[PDB]
Amino acid sequence: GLVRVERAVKERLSLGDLDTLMPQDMINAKPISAAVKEFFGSSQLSQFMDQ
Amino acid sequence: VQVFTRDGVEKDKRALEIEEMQLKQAKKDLSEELQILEAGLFSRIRAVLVA
Amino acid sequence: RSVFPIQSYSGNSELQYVSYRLGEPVFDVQECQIRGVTYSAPLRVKLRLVIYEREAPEGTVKDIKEQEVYMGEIPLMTDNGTFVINGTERVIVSQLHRSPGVF
Amino acid sequence: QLKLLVTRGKEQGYLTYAEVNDHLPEDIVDSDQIEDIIQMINDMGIQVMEEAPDADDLMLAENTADEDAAEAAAQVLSSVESEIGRTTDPVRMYMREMGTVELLTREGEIDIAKRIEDGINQVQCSVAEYPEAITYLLEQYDRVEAEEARLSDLITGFVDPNAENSIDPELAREKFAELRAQYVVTRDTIKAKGRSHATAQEEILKLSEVFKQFRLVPKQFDYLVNSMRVMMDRVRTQERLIMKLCVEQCKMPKKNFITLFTGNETSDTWFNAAIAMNKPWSEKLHDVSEEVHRALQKLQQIEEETGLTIEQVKDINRRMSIGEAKARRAKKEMVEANLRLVISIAKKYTNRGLQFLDLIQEGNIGLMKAVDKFEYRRGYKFSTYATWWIRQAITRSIADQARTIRIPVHMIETINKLNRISRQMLQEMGREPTPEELAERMLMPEDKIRKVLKISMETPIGDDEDSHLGIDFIEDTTSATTESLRAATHDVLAGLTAREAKVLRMRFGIDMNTDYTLEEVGKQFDVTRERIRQIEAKALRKLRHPSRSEVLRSFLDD
Amino acid sequence: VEIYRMMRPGEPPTREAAESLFENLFFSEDRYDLSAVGRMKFNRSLLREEI
């Protein structure tokens, strides 16, 4: 995931005068919430436990 | 029984009575816990004195 | 540690790293059924930036900046060895695979 | 694949026969096809093979073509396209299709723009020459000032002078006096001394000089060119028909029409000469000539409609299309010259957005409005033009296009302002999102933002929002239920107290087809006054007994 | 170049990408790993002595 989805960060890191910009300014936050919450809830091996 | 909403709407009457159903338990238990706690802690100070 | 520091291909910037973190929870297992939301907390990461002499030949470095940023979420686990996910104990089964390399 | 062979051959100005295997088209195998297709490889690239020259290089300089205008310079599309890999993607074929253009940028596409203008600004010189076109040009304005008191209509959306926009209202009005003066002489001095015989050609030329400033909106311009295309085909339909009648009626093929028509076009004079020829076909005309005069008299009835002669149509309407051949080669060639810049912008947005492909081809249509409005006459570059206009054509290609739903665009991309702002929320409140934080980040109340979000996501069943209550549906398709609530309220409010049973129907539309104030109601209540209105509300306190609606409530439900 | 064809039939074999297309099967930032565990199994199934 760290080598397939980071595109806007990996792109826009090339362009700014980073003496006056910061190690944060383009990091999206939506996807790695649900995609790691629900890696335990809808993943190929993460069924409802046999309670 | 539960009721939920977008948070700026503080919660509906059937949840606001259940607030006082859940609060009763902690309101009581913390009033026992504080006594259970100091009946240990001050009993250690009391033991150092009894020595 | 397999991707960062991203010292950029453009040769003018670098997105450095120090380590991960987990913190800042709000739900607990009771709310993770009664409400239902997955028992989880934010993945946050220590990141940095450094830039060099543009103009001189005796100091080698000129700027240094460092912080944390968000980079995702992580589910949480009990003493009982369980997890709570959409109202329910949804739980990962381990795999038995051909060992990586060659066969 | 092909491009390797043809490009290195043209760079070399020469290509040896066997170099078809040194720079091979990585495509095909057609070894015996070579011995004739070599022909159009040589009239624009000639070379052959022997042991060694010593002083013999010059051969190209007496034996080769001179402009690479449209021929094997572009029909080579088929011979580079021909091997698309049978199952593999549109994200491959475009790489073969751009086997045409490499990188004509930074001055080559500026020369395409120079060649647009020796198109358009030279078609102008023949608008100024075809005597009907310069008439319909002024008929554009003479259709509208003619009614004694006007300001807009066809006065607006016209005049439109790219005199590098350097005019005022009176210099704009002078466009109908200056050019009108050059016109009203030339319009008939084309018949003084002869069509272009001495000074008639100079008069045409000076009208064609002033009209160089009459460079116009692409559709006011193309209206005048379409007028010249249609007025050409008034003659070309008649030629196309009468040549067919030389076969069909006369048995006199292609060349023999041209042999007789094209030096006295105007009338049945040349057709009567076609009888006078004799030969069995011409001999047949002595008992069918009437049926040809019944058609050729409507080539004559075009000169009779205008004061033209076909002597003008022979050259002017071709001079038009010599300008069009530049203007619309260049307004094609300019799109071709930029087909790569469309990928590098569009492919950013194709990032799963809807598909990896389709936005590029919508950018290739945004590029049409860009090529039409390319104001290089400000100074700026087509790179910046694409970064604005073609980028937002690429954006809109899946913003509201190809969706389930579509709205005025401020109310589309505002939903995406909120998703853009959420990049703070998810790390500053920083555990889950909360609209309560978005309210400070937008300085606005949640519901006047929910104005959009209540309906613009995929639209609930809101029939015509709420206005469907008062629209076209007020016909018996709804009002039969009104004529049921009215019945039930008419029942109860006529069993109630002998006085009180009037009042408690007034103001808002309850019981009558005009639910009056005092005058016609007090005269049916008698004795006293505005108890006539107060008892519409009195019911709240001794009609308190909630059973008092036991026969009223069904009309939410029928 | 023939390996570029084996992933892109009917498309020009862009010289430098013909090398990347193959070498990035085994050396890309995104597209290859074994862990130390899989390098150990690789060396083990080849009877190496390189620890």
mmCIF file with all atom_site columns, N, CA and C in Angstrom, chain D residues 398-419:
data_model
loop_
_atom_site.group_PDB
_atom_site.id
_atom_site.type_symbol
_atom_site.label_atom_id
_atom_site.label_alt_id
_atom_site.label_comp_id
_atom_site.label_asym_id
_atom_site.label_entity_id
_atom_site.label_seq_id
_atom_site.pdbx_PDB_ins_code
_atom_site.Cartn_x
_atom_site.Cartn_y
_atom_site.Cartn_z
_atom_site.occupancy
_atom_site.B_iso_or_equiv
_atom_site.pdbx_formal_charge
_atom_site.auth_seq_id
_atom_site.auth_comp_id
_atom_site.auth_asym_id
_atom_site.auth_atom_id
_atom_site.pdbx_PDB_model_num
ATOM 1  N N  . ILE D 1 398 ? -15.696 13.540 -16.167 1.00 0.00 ? 398 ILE D N  1
ATOM 2  C CA . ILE D 1 398 ? -16.303 12.643 -15.169 1.00 0.00 ? 398 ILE D CA 1
ATOM 3  C C  . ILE D 1 398 ? -16.749 13.374 -13.881 1.00 0.00 ? 398 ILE D C  1
ATOM 4  N N  . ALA D 1 399 ? -16.808 14.713 -13.859 1.00 0.00 ? 399 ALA D N  1
ATOM 5  C CA . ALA D 1 399 ? -17.377 15.456 -12.724 1.00 0.00 ? 399 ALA D CA 1
ATOM 6  C C  . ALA D 1 399 ? -18.898 15.248 -12.659 1.00 0.00 ? 399 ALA D C  1
ATOM 7  N N  . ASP D 1 400 ? -19.614 15.654 -13.715 1.00 0.00 ? 400 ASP D N  1
ATOM 8  C CA . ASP D 1 400 ? -21.068 15.516 -13.882 1.00 0.00 ? 400 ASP D CA 1
ATOM 9  C C  . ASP D 1 400 ? -21.438 14.672 -15.121 1.00 0.00 ? 400 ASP D C  1
ATOM 10 N N  . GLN D 1 401 ? -20.607 14.682 -16.170 1.00 0.00 ? 401 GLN D N  1
ATOM 11 C CA . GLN D 1 401 ? -20.667 13.670 -17.228 1.00 0.00 ? 401 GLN D CA 1
ATOM 12 C C  . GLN D 1 401 ? -20.436 12.256 -16.641 1.00 0.00 ? 401 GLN D C  1
ATOM 13 N N  . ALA D 1 402 ? -21.077 11.244 -17.240 1.00 0.00 ? 402 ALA D N  1
ATOM 14 C CA . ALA D 1 402 ? -20.993 9.814  -16.891 1.00 0.00 ? 402 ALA D CA 1
ATOM 15 C C  . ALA D 1 402 ? -21.433 9.411  -15.460 1.00 0.00 ? 402 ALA D C  1
ATOM 16 N N  . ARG D 1 403 ? -21.864 10.357 -14.616 1.00 0.00 ? 403 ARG D N  1
ATOM 17 C CA . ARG D 1 403 ? -22.474 10.119 -13.296 1.00 0.00 ? 403 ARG D CA 1
ATOM 18 C C  . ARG D 1 403 ? -23.903 9.553  -13.383 1.00 0.00 ? 403 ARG D C  1
ATOM 19 N N  . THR D 1 404 ? -24.489 9.253  -12.222 1.00 0.00 ? 404 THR D N  1
ATOM 20 C CA . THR D 1 404 ? -25.949 9.081  -12.051 1.00 0.00 ? 404 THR D CA 1
ATOM 21 C C  . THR D 1 404 ? -26.675 10.430 -12.001 1.00 0.00 ? 404 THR D C  1
ATOM 22 N N  . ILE D 1 405 ? -25.984 11.459 -11.509 1.00 0.00 ? 405 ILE D N  1
ATOM 23 C CA . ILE D 1 405 ? -26.518 12.745 -11.058 1.00 0.00 ? 405 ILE D CA 1
ATOM 24 C C  . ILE D 1 405 ? -25.669 13.901 -11.601 1.00 0.00 ? 405 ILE D C  1
ATOM 25 N N  . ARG D 1 406 ? -26.281 15.074 -11.772 1.00 0.00 ? 406 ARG D N  1
ATOM 26 C CA . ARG D 1 406 ? -25.663 16.271 -12.364 1.00 0.00 ? 406 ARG D CA 1
ATOM 27 C C  . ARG D 1 406 ? -26.440 17.513 -11.925 1.00 0.00 ? 406 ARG D C  1
ATOM 28 N N  . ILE D 1 407 ? -25.705 18.564 -11.590 1.00 0.00 ? 407 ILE D N  1
ATOM 29 C CA . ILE D 1 407 ? -26.114 19.795 -10.893 1.00 0.00 ? 407 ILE D CA 1
ATOM 30 C C  . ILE D 1 407 ? -25.311 20.951 -11.543 1.00 0.00 ? 407 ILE D C  1
ATOM 31 N N  . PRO D 1 408 ? -25.746 22.225 -11.475 1.00 0.00 ? 408 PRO D N  1
ATOM 32 C CA . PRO D 1 408 ? -24.852 23.381 -11.619 1.00 0.00 ? 408 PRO D CA 1
ATOM 33 C C  . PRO D 1 408 ? -23.516 23.194 -10.862 1.00 0.00 ? 408 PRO D C  1
ATOM 34 N N  . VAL D 1 409 ? -22.392 23.522 -11.508 1.00 0.00 ? 409 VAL D N  1
ATOM 35 C CA . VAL D 1 409 ? -21.078 22.884 -11.234 1.00 0.00 ? 409 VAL D CA 1
ATOM 36 C C  . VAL D 1 409 ? -20.437 23.306 -9.911  1.00 0.00 ? 409 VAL D C  1
ATOM 37 N N  . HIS D 1 410 ? -20.640 24.549 -9.485  1.00 0.00 ? 410 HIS D N  1
ATOM 38 C CA . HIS D 1 410 ? -20.350 25.043 -8.130  1.00 0.00 ? 410 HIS D CA 1
ATOM 39 C C  . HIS D 1 410 ? -20.893 24.079 -7.054  1.00 0.00 ? 410 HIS D C  1
ATOM 40 N N  . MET D 1 411 ? -22.110 23.553 -7.244  1.00 0.00 ? 411 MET D N  1
ATOM 41 C CA . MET D 1 411 ? -22.749 22.580 -6.346  1.00 0.00 ? 411 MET D CA 1
ATOM 42 C C  . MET D 1 411 ? -22.319 21.116 -6.592  1.00 0.00 ? 411 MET D C  1
ATOM 43 N N  . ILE D 1 412 ? -21.570 20.817 -7.666  1.00 0.00 ? 412 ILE D N  1
ATOM 44 C CA . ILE D 1 412 ? -20.836 19.547 -7.826  1.00 0.00 ? 412 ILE D CA 1
ATOM 45 C C  . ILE D 1 412 ? -19.538 19.621 -7.016  1.00 0.00 ? 412 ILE D C  1
ATOM 46 N N  . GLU D 1 413 ? -18.619 20.510 -7.404  1.00 0.00 ? 413 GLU D N  1
ATOM 47 C CA . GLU D 1 413 ? -17.257 20.491 -6.865  1.00 0.00 ? 413 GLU D CA 1
ATOM 48 C C  . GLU D 1 413 ? -17.190 21.020 -5.421  1.00 0.00 ? 413 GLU D C  1
ATOM 49 N N  . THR D 1 414 ? -18.198 21.751 -4.920  1.00 0.00 ? 414 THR D N  1
ATOM 50 C CA . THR D 1 414 ? -18.348 22.029 -3.473  1.00 0.00 ? 414 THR D CA 1
ATOM 51 C C  . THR D 1 414 ? -18.434 20.760 -2.616  1.00 0.00 ? 414 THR D C  1
ATOM 52 N N  . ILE D 1 415 ? -19.085 19.685 -3.080  1.00 0.00 ? 415 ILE D N  1
ATOM 53 C CA . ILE D 1 415 ? -19.074 18.375 -2.385  1.00 0.00 ? 415 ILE D CA 1
ATOM 54 C C  . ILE D 1 415 ? -17.628 17.847 -2.248  1.00 0.00 ? 415 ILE D C  1
ATOM 55 N N  . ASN D 1 416 ? -16.769 18.242 -3.186  1.00 0.00 ? 416 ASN D N  1
ATOM 56 C CA . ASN D 1 416 ? -15.375 17.842 -3.256  1.00 0.00 ? 416 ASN D CA 1
ATOM 57 C C  . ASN D 1 416 ? -14.464 18.830 -2.509  1.00 0.00 ? 416 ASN D C  1
ATOM 58 N N  . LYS D 1 417 ? -14.834 20.116 -2.357  1.00 0.00 ? 417 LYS D N  1
ATOM 59 C CA . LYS D 1 417 ? -14.255 21.030 -1.347  1.00 0.00 ? 417 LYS D CA 1
ATOM 60 C C  . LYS D 1 417 ? -14.324 20.402 0.048   1.00 0.00 ? 417 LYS D C  1
ATOM 61 N N  . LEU D 1 418 ? -15.468 19.828 0.440   1.00 0.00 ? 418 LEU D N  1
ATOM 62 C CA . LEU D 1 418 ? -15.621 19.163 1.748   1.00 0.00 ? 418 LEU D CA 1
ATOM 63 C C  . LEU D 1 418 ? -14.698 17.935 1.904   1.00 0.00 ? 418 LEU D C  1
ATOM 64 N N  . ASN D 1 419 ? -14.595 17.083 0.877   1.00 0.00 ? 419 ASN D N  1
ATOM 65 C CA . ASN D 1 419 ? -13.657 15.948 0.877   1.00 0.00 ? 419 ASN D CA 1
ATOM 66 C C  . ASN D 1 419 ? -12.182 16.412 0.903   1.00 0.00 ? 419 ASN D C  1
#
